[PDB]
Amino acid sequence: KPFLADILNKAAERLGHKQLWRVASQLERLPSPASADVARDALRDICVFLSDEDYAHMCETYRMIDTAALIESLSTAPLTPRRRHVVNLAVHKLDPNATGIISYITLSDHYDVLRHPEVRNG
Amino acid sequence: MREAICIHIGQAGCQVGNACWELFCLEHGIQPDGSMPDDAFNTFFSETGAGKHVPRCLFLDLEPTVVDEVRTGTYRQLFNPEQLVSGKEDAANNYARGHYTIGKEIVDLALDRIRKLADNCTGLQGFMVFHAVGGGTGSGLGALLLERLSVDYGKKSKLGYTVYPSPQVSTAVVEPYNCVLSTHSLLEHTDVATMLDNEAIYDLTRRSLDIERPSYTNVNRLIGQVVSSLTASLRFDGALNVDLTEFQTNLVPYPRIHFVLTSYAPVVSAEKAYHEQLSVADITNSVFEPAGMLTKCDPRHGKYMSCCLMYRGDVVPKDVNAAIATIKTKRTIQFVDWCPTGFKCGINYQPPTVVPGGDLAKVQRAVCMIANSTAIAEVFARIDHKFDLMYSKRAFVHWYVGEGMEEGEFSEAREDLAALEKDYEEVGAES
Amino acid sequence: MREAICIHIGQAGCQVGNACWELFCLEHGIQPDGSMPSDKCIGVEDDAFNTFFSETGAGKHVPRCLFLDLEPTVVDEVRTGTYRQLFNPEQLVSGKEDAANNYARGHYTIGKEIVDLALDRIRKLADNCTGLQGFMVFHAVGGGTGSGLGALLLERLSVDYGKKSKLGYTVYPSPQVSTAVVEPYNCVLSTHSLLEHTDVATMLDNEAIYDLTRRSLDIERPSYTNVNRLIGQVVSSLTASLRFDGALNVDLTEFQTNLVPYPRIHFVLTSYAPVVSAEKAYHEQLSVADITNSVFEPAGMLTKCDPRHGKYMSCCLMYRGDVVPKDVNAAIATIKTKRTIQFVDWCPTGFKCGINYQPPTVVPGGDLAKVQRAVCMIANSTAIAEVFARIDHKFDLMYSKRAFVHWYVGEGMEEGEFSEAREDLAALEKDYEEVGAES
Amino acid sequence: REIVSCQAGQCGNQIGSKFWEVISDEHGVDPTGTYQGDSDLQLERINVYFDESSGGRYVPRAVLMDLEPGTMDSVRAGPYGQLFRPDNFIFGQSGAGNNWAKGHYTEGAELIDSVLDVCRKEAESCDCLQGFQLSHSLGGGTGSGMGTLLISKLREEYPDRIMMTFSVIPSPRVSDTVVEPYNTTLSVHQLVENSDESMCIDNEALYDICFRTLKLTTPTFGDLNHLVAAVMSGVTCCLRFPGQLNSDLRKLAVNLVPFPRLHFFMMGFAPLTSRGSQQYRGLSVAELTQQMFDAKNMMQAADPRHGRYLTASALFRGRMSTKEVDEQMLNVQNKNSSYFIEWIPNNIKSSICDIPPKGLKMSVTFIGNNTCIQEMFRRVGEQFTGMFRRKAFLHWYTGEGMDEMEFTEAESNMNDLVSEYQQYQDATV
Amino acid sequence: TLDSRMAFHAQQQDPGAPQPRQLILRYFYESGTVELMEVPSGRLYLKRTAVDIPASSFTVGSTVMLFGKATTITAFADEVTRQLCAQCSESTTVVITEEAFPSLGRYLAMLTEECCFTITDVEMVWVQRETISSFNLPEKLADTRIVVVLCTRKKAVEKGFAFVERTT
Amino acid sequence: VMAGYRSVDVLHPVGEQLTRNYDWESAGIDPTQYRFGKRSTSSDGTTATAL
């Protein structure tokens, strides 16, 4: 998965670690399935770039691209199974109905601050 | 750091080393090529600049069949073309030949390669010599190489895993002669000597592992599993770590007392592993049962002078202590009066591994048993009877006489072997 | 600058020089035609090759060598083979009638009609060099032209060029295996010339090279080709210090005084490692300490002269490749700790080391494998008295009742020359024994 | 106050190259020669080591010496090689071959004349020089044999200038020369009566510092020479930079040479920490002083606590306080009064410079005239006598022009020096 | 010393000197090592020293810094070097018109990373009604503002064709 | 008879390496074009960086 690793890192430095949600927003605005050209365009307007070899590898592993599969791999592969089930539990708690929609009120209710070490520092 | 140099002598030694190394390669994730597709392998393998590793072992036999089998088998890539010495004609179950005539033309280069390995090593913990005294080369060269190693390295740690002749099953008629001749060398010039008789492990495999037709492959595989269990403490981190000298100072109470019994549990098969709930107490009890013992030496027939338990896996000190108390409470085994504690345990977090072509089912928890017991006098009381009943009227003696050994060496070896039990029951006698 | 003249005498000298010059051309990127490859024809050239090849305005290098043999077969083989373009028609001086293993014939009858031309060629080569370090003479004392003509040439060089350095990398008769039967005569007669008229002498006997090739390079049937390839590798390893940039470069006179303690004591044992095939090279930990230990091993040298039976006088190590000065220091410290090899009491330091950044090169189509690092060791030791004892016991047992002496006396040689040579070799034993004796 | 430098032998040339690039970096001088320093203090005394040409760019006031041209070529090919003046590369054709006789009597005499010519013109160019530096190794042939001849001739021509001789005296277990004790014995006697102050360096101690003080697995000669380069740059920095209490070579000599023959010092440099220990230790005079006197931080492999410090000098660099630069040295005196000599009170000369070395907030250079250095002289003399009993490795010297009587006189002078050190180490008031 | 190397004629132009130094430098591309000599004599100007400058920037017509020295490559030195440099670092030009100025950085980023080109030079050019015919640029760029990139890569012409097909 | 001697060959060629058929392709090393040995350690950091 060299193209997955490259895109994940590239986004991490270019946008910041805390806002990797931009790639998800772009790929959701993409239709399912999406053509490779528009996938490149929309994915890359956020200034994340892939080499031609990595792009060819991505196309071969995945004209249409399974954008849902790309999202799943991006959010799934770079996690060891510990992190896999940890994030699965967090998402399940955030969305108990498995509806694929997270609201501000529910996230604020389910988000904890008081145990953070820095707010313990005060 | 923590290097341990392995030496294998004879057919039995080479087979045991083959099993040991096919186990260690998987324990470190090293392919038979020598490279993996953390300096844990530094103890056994020497890393090269090509990204692959070479084992720190010397194979040696005066006949070429086993060594060319190694040189042609799967581990050609792994094994160094040197440190894999071949002879020209074997001793052929003749300690005289393997020690005086035809072993002296190979011992010099054997020590040359061994000292090359030692110079490669930096923090060498000790030598591990795998052989069988019942054979000719394994006795003769097992004496010559060990005495030369002793005179060259002084008091450096040496552990000799010796496949002693079994009381009932023996594949040679001069086997008792070789054993009695070589016990002198295994006594004076070996820091620890480990019993590895055949028929006991045979019965263990037949009963616990349930194979109708086991073989030497299985017995050496189990022996290698025991070896790796004992040596894993210096190879992976654990709650309680034990080094070679660390358990030597606990298992050698007197300089003459260094012959040690071994066992291993759970020795279970694939079908029976899933159903059983393996606990620390259960595995410790199965260890202390004579059934799980891999040497024909009944624990009930003697007093355990010292115990040392290599616990591997998710084993924990609380359960270790609970098992310790249970062993103290039950009367199946008794300890020597002047040895109150009598126990040592080494806990390691690395669970044992299982290799292809084997029968053991991998268990998240296991434990090996290394013991000094007064019952070891019984195997020697079998061997001395076995030897005297043939030496009473001078049988199988002309072969040794014509190979440059004086006839009085037999009497000297017999007297030394008798001194072995005259010390065993002496130290086992209650104060 | 830093030029050295290679004089090859006899068949053995001629063939070992052929191997040496092939290897030198390979190291300096010189095609067999004598010129640099067309693809890398850069206009400006470095001064590295100047030590062994003389530059021509046409851009074609010429080796600083003198091939010399009474027998025309080997020199004609050189002049016909793949290096005819590289080699000058001159400096390849040829005789017409052979010496035929006769020191008397090669030094007293047939050598005089060609020694003058040989010295003319030497002068022609020397006037071209402005920084001549010295002469390296390759020959075998076993034969006639190697012993006799070589002795005469070294005598003339000593009387003409004064105190110019001289290194005879000569092939003495191996102890148990020999090719010539009057080879002991030739060796004992030429030891007088190699003692007084040669500044350093290096032993390159054949059976030690055979055993090395068999046991380390894994060649069941080695030949003179392989022997000469190893000898050329050793020569290149010793001479590369002034050829290439290194951490500690040494010249000829840098190790001359460090390896010669007394004027009469300059015979030195040679050794080189790692010498291993590609099938085995990466199986061992080819480190500086490992290669130093392998060199010091009796089975890793080029001579059948056990050091444990003798006592080292002065050691010189020539490291090539990625060697580090304190890796060398650690090897020296472990050699000090080692007790199997022991030095003489009056020479505490006893070590020279020269580190060079140029790893050895392997000839195309060869059998040796290129290595990250290598080392060549040249050592003065007291153990050479044993090979001298072998050869002089051979000579006395041959000379007891006048064997083959008629051939020598029929070529203008007095009978007392043999006795004088025997006394000289006895003194060469006695001084080694005396200096090796404890204080 | 001008110091003209000389490099002799391969060791001396490499050490001088390292020192010259270090001082050029400190003064902000690129290999082009143009100054680009970020502070005017560099130009304020750039003259001490640099003399500029008509183009406004500076060149080192250095003289390079070797019979071999190979090390000259390497030095010129170095990153700062082109900064040197081409006429200052004086080289011969035939090397010394580790022969003090060859470098001092026959091959050195034919070239010391040109070296003296260039040194004379360089000394006359400046207003009035403070003196001479030499960088050489006493174990080699041309570095030592020609080095001592240079020392003698420059002493004869300029009696009243300060002569510093950075001599790399080498150790047997790190040795690489069989005639090393011969060369060292033949050089030390010249240095005794011909050098104002000798600056002792051992490759073993440099290696020890590189191994455990710096925790570098394999730093080569390019890293060993950087330490002595820093030593030179910190020992001369008093001239080139201002300070609260400035000093000079003459000040160090008068405060560290109680007797004319007692002018050999061992070197140490502070601070010296690994990359991983940079953020673990606080940089302060308290941490500098403890390592100033430590054995593993001292870069001359002669053990310091088997001798009594006759004198010592601490050249501090960086804006600091005058309290803890001398109160802590008094603390060292008090709690190591056994290790410091009695009849000389406050063995410590202290000097302060306002400009620390580049990249270091604070630094100190330690120069000590301890009597423990007699161990090196005694053991190298033992080696010299061991080879001299049997006349080994001596036909070269005899044929090159040396005399047995001169060898014996050198041995006697060495014994006199070691006895001079010993009789002050042991005697009481 | 036998290692494969790239040899280039180079100039330094030391301050005050009336003429360039006229050196040659060999870069051993398998490593980071460089060495230099001068054409007239041949003395070793610089030893074999490792540099941090990437190998892709050692092409012809490019200037680099070697220990504070501005060293400019003028031309190759050997035909083996010319062959290998043609195989590896092939040069090409891409001209982007005035309608893509808001995506100027976008196109440059795709040149650097999408197309794996390395940008030896990037400039802007005001096209003239005479320069258009003098240098044979498309007529639609006359009297406009363009950006020109000198970029090198393997198969540079084909990569540029792919770029101009994938962009407007 | 000497004409029949043509078909007779040499039992052992001279200068033949005793190759035991290593798997160099899987090992990833070309024996002829690989410099066998240990790349000497490169001490990370230098004295200049330390100062």
Ligand SMILES: Nc1nc2c(ncn2[C@@H]2O[C@H](COP(=O)(O)OP(=O)(O)OP(=O)(O)O)[C@@H](O)[C@H]2O)c(=O)[nH]1
């Ligand atoms: N553990 C183990 N023991 C074996 C094995 N093979 C044979 N043995 C036993 O070990 C004893 C020693 O015999 P060998 O293995 O042949 O050793 P040896 O006799 O010294 O070898 P040679 O003298 O060359 O024949 C025999 O009597 C066998 O009973 C084996 O593969 N593993």
Ligand SMILES: Nc1nc2c(ncn2[C@@H]2O[C@H](COP(=O)(O)OP(=O)(O)OP(=O)(O)O)[C@@H](O)[C@H]2O)c(=O)[nH]1
């Ligand atoms: N190392 C090496 N030794 C050789 C070689 N050829 C011969 N020798 C040995 O060196 C000894 C000297 O032989 P030659 O070099 O032929 O000397 P020679 O017999 O005087 O030569 P001619 O009189 O011309 O035939 C012989 O006895 C051989 O054993 C060779 O090519 N390499």
Ligand SMILES: Nc1nc2c(ncn2[C@@H]2O[C@H](COP(=O)(O)OP(=O)(O)O)[C@@H](O)[C@H]2O)c(=O)[nH]1
């Ligand atoms: N610090 C340091 N010491 C060196 C260097 N080169 C050589 N040496 C030492 O100098 C000694 C040899 O001196 P040498 O250079 O041969 O002196 P010369 O023959 O007079 O030129 C060796 O023992 C080395 O330890 C170097 O670059 N730096």
Ligand SMILES: [Mg+2]
């Ligand atoms: Mg057998």
Ligand SMILES: [Mg+2]
């Ligand atoms: Mg001939």
Ligand SMILES: [Mg+2]
């Ligand atoms: Mg003042």
